[PDB]
Amino acid sequence: MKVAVLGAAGGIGQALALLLKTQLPSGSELSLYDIAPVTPGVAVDLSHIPTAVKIKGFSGEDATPALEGADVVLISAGLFNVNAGIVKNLVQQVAKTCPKACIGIITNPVNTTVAIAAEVLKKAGVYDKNKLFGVTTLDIIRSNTFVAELKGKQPGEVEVPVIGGHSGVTILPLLSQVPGVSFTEQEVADLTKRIQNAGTEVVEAKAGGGSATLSMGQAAARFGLSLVRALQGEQGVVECAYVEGDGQYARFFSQPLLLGKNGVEERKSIGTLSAFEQNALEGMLDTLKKDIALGQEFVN
Numbered sequence: 189m190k191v192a193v194l195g196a197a198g199g200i201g202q203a204l205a206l207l208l209k210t211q212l213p214s215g216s217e218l219s220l221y222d223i224a225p226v227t228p229g230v231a232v233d234l235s236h237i238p239t240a241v242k243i244k245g246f247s248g249e250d251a252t253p254a255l256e257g258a259d260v261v262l263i264s265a266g267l268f269n270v271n272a273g274i275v276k277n278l279v280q281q282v283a284k285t286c287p288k289a290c291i292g293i294i295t296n297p298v299n300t301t302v303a304i305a306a307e308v309l310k311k312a313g314v315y316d317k318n319k320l321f322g323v324t325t326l327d328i329i330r331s332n333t334f335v336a337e338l339k340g341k342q343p344g345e346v347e348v349p350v351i352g353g354h355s356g357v358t359i360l361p362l363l364s365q366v367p368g369v370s371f372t373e374q375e376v377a378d379l380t381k382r383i384q385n386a387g388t389e390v391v392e393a394k395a396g397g398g399s400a401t402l403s404m405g406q407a408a409a410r411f412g413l414s415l416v417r418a419l420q421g422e423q424g425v426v427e428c429a430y431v432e433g434d435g436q437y438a439r440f441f442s443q444p445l446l447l448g449k450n451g452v453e454e455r456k457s458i459g460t461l462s463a464f465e466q467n468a469l470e471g472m473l474d475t476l477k478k479d480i481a482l483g484q485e486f487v488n
């Protein structure tokens with residue numbers, strides 16, 4: 189099982205490649221691609237770590253050598269028009285090479301970049317809605333951290349469902365579904381406000397030094413590993429991701445997903461929502477639908 193990381197020389201990409209090199213199952217393969225000429229040396233660097241994960245790095249404007257045989261493609265390359273054009277170009281490159289591969293978009297704005305990728309794969313006639321994922325895992329592990337700190341739980345034993353989008357008011361953590369933990373109405377609003385603004389927390393603390401890179405690589409690594417495990421045939425692998433589903437709330441929407449040997453095996457229901465959550469859901473659907481349309485019009 190081969191994972192291709194497009195944009196592997198950036199902050200997110202290098203952290204993701206390090207975690208995949210050290211945590212991918214034995215026998216996996218890892219290919220790094222980035223326009224930065226350092227990328228082949230990034231792979232040789234990681235190649236000295238003693239794990240059973242073959243790794244090779246590529247540069248230049250042609251990513252196709254890195255994409256050959258890839259079963260999973262994670263795109264973290266990357267103002268909006270520049271990043272939007274980068275996502276569209278790289279997804280067009282994947283459609284020429286590995287039309288099967290599961291594709292996880294990390295490049296922000298995820299609410300828009302996933303719609304960009306979908307319209308591209310459609311134009312190439314290779315689009316499979318069970319194989320395109322918007323990586324929203326950072327919202328989950330942030331919610332796990334904030335809930336565990338507030339409620340005095342072990343951070344590794346808390347799992348918060350997070351649905352909707354990946355930006356601002358479209359991030360809706362379903363705090364009413366955390367087992368064994370109850371929240372006041374003040375704690376729900378406060379936690380929701382911090383979870384929706386957590387990206388700005390990092391930008392301000394970095395004093396202009398950028399946004400989240402290390403925790404984003406950790407979240408992307410968690411999702412990629414779950415995908416790889418499910419593609420190997422492991423059962424009961426459930427992760428949340430921004431995907432094109434039934435369109436009950438929006439064309440793309442983050443929800444629990446049973447993963448399988450072909451990507452999505454079943455889109456699980458979001459479950460019961462509290463009054464606060466159902467109101468936060470319908471209050472942000474307009475912004476989410478506009479996020480999607482922005483990506484749809486960028487391609488069309």
Ligand SMILES: [Ag+]
Pocket residue numbers: 255256257258259285286288289
């Ligand atoms: Ag392939």
Ligand SMILES: [Ag+]
Pocket residue numbers: 255256257258285286287
């Ligand atoms: Ag291929």
Ligand SMILES: [Ag+]
Pocket residue numbers: 259260288289290419449450451
């Ligand atoms: Ag696949």
Ligand SMILES: [Ag+]
Pocket residue numbers: 288289290291318319450451
């Ligand atoms: Ag797939």
Ligand SMILES: [Ag+]
Pocket residue numbers: 294296323326404
């Ligand atoms: Ag992210």
Ligand SMILES: [Ag+]
Pocket residue numbers: 328348349350351428443444
């Ligand atoms: Ag979730």
Ligand SMILES: [Ag+]
Pocket residue numbers: 348349350426427428443444445
């Ligand atoms: Ag989930």
